[PDB]
Amino acid sequence: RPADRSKTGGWASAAMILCIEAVERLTTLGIGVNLVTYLTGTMHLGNATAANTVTNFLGTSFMLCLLGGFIADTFLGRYLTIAIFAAIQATGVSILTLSTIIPSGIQLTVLYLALYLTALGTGGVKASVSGFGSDQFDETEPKERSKMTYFFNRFFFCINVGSLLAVTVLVYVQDDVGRKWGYGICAFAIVLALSVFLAGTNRYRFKKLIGSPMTQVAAVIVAAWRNRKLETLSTLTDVEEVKQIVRMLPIWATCILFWTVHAQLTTLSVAQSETLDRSIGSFEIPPASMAVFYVGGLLLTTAVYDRVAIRLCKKLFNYPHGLRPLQRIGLGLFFGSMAMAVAALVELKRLRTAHAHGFYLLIPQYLIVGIGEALIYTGQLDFFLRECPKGMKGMSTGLLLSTLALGFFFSSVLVTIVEKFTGKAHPWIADDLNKGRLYNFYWLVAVLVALNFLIFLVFSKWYVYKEKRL
Amino acid sequence: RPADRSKTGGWASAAMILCIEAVERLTTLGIGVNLVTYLTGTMHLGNATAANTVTNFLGTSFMLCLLGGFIADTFLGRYLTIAIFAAIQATGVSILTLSTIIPSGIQLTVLYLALYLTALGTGGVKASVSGFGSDQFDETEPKERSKMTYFFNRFFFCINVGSLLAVTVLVYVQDDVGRKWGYGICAFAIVLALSVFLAGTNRYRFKKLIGSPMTQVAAVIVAAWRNRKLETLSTLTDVEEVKQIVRMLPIWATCILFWTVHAQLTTLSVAQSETLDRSIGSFEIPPASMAVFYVGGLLLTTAVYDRVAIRLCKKLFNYPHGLRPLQRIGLGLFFGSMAMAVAALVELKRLRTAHAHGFYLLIPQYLIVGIGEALIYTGQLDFFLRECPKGMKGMSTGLLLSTLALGFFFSSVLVTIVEKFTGKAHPWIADDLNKGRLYNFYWLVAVLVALNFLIFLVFSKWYVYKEKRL
């Protein structure tokens, strides 16, 4: 409990903590990627009822992540938010596993809890583990930087294996073996990982910290309304700083429609998987398992771009990376409607065949999302790091999490928006995907994403003119 | 973090904390009381070899309890021990459940691990949860003592029902319904109880706690080997205070042999239970459910004594209670050998019936213990509260935990001797109780505990003259 010591505060901070972030990552795909598959046939819900029920949970997980970090900085440490919210998810996810053995009226009540209770733990844990595990940073770094910067890339490209496995074997363990084991190992994993984290409380050193903007932004919002009747250095610096965060808004709000096209891939693009040519020789591929094409698309787009950057930067002269501030976001938003347009065409080519009376077909759409996604996220991330004052740098990861969350809610609004305006004679998102006319749902989304990208393209122009004067 | 506040640190400290104590106990009985039952049939082991292992596990739960209490007091918080060691048994008691469902050589290493791992988590949590949950103490107790001493008496006779039920219904679910639910639910209880304990990390004030005697006892033991060549107030009082604790030893050691009769009751009498008249009409009674008669024995005796205390104290003039300082311990030891002899004479009355070719026969041996236990325990307890200074007061419970730990450990040693000193043509404890001549094993305990009683009486005659001479 006193102060720093080279022979105490160590690599356990690295090793024994991030295991929770790694388990939380195994969990969010392994569950979040599937779930609709479980709600469709195991719990028995309509195709337009499970996807809406899934987006809400995934979105909520990010909506929480915003508060998770804010709790961890502004109140009762970062070591507690890991301790409490790892435990909360173990309680949550262990109930989810008991929701696959005990026995809808008072079982959906039981499932909905464990689902949105896993998202509470998941949310608060993810927002603090990574930030706490990195507590391996000295003054000028006496040879720490070497092991630290390396360990994290020896962990980051390590959980990239465990992300592919989550979509591959964990799905297969749910779809073929049983949801008892599938969610069971996600639950045992977390108790085992939380127990070891708590045991290392010794080899870790906890540091004292405050969390803005939010606190500083709220104080300015108070000054606005309390001085409504009237219509020193803080006004000459701290208020002009807050106005700069309002400049991201159009770029921020336009990015929300990319996270809707990523949400269909998790839900609606799995109802198309299950209903088309499954078998490959003797054994088979699970429906959810098509996300390997999306996961691969990310991992390939990062690897290929990491080499194909200096080549782009040398041909067309730029400062650090291959023009990844604002052009990166746009490329991902162009690919965003492209996947939705490709999916619409892919639906017409085989549902029109079903009226006359499979695995290959969905691979492209899943990859077009994976390619555009690896750009937009690193475009979004490397935006307010380079385009926000250093007082609020890294304190605008919420500007990433608030893009996501709202993208899931924008999908769930859209799904319900076509549930009433097309129902019930011949709806798009039909209970029997073949009976209805689903492709028209992509004609609404692809179209929204295309026209959204057009306004984004006009926002960037009005930004390199209105924010290049500050 | 900062300082106490009446508007926060209250009943939440009493409720959310102590829920792990109820869970900790519930578990220890349901798991511990059975286990032999599992090992015998489920895991396929000899009756002399299963008992031996389980006494060491139990004995450990209490041996770890000695260490745990000290760990918490001498290093990094009590809260932290409750948090860490609740998570150790959460993991430890779930691998026991995965030991029931996944599948001897490898399956035993996994079991022993998971058992001895639970004993680790159980010892540390048991020793602290009570000590922390009771942090509702101010200077003159402004109406705290009223609600606090009411909550601790309300919570006491709540876990007495649970201890009843742990033997009654949790055993049914282990035997009849399959362990999986029995050992599984024991785990769900803790994961939940650990998250909820961490939910109230708000309404908790962590006091500036100090740990002893041990820290002082060790310094005196350290001073002996370095003052070998020599053959201000620390010698004039701390060493004088340390030598007074060695006076407990004769009696302290004598009690160990009661806890051996309580252990045989847990082990061998559960193998006798399963080989005798089960059928009680339509439904059947579980073998390990005989322990209800010992629980009743503890319960009924505590209820009966508290009412008939002033009556015995009036007829024979005494100060606070009806003569329970040392004389109480003699009563429990007399009852101690009374149960083994009754259990010996019971075997002759029906294992002789087996060779010539049942449920009520095992009811007295459990009652005689339970009665004798309620006297020897409070006797042992109210021993060093009055016969030790207020500096080491309550730091004499370690003498109680080392009576149990060594008492259950003594069974394994006892059996080990009698297994390797009688076999293998006609041994005492055998896989087939009808075959083996076990009746005399009970006479051996009955004799070693009868001797012990005579050894105790001699020691008590001196303890009222060699310690009263002060």
From Swiss-Prot, chains A, B:
Induction context: By nitrate and auxin.
GO biological process: auxin-activated signaling pathway; basipetal auxin transport; lateral root development; nitrate assimilation; nitrate transmembrane transport; oligopeptide transport; photoperiodism, flowering; response to herbicide
Effect on the protein upon substituting E21A: Loss of the transporter activity
CDD domains, sorted: MFS_NPF6
UniProt signal peptide: none
Residue list for modification Phosphothreonine: T81
PANTHER family: OLIGOPEPTIDE TRANSPORTER-RELATED (PTHR11654)
Note: When mutated confers resistance to the herbicide chlorate. The kinase CIPK23 is a negative regulator of the high-affinity response, while the kinase CIPK8 is a positive regulator of the low-affinity response. Thr-81 is not the direct target of CIPK8.
Assembly and interaction partners: Monomer and homodimer. The dimer has the 2 monomers in the same orientation. Interacts with CIPK23.
Protein name as catalogued: Protein NRT1/ PTR FAMILY 6.3
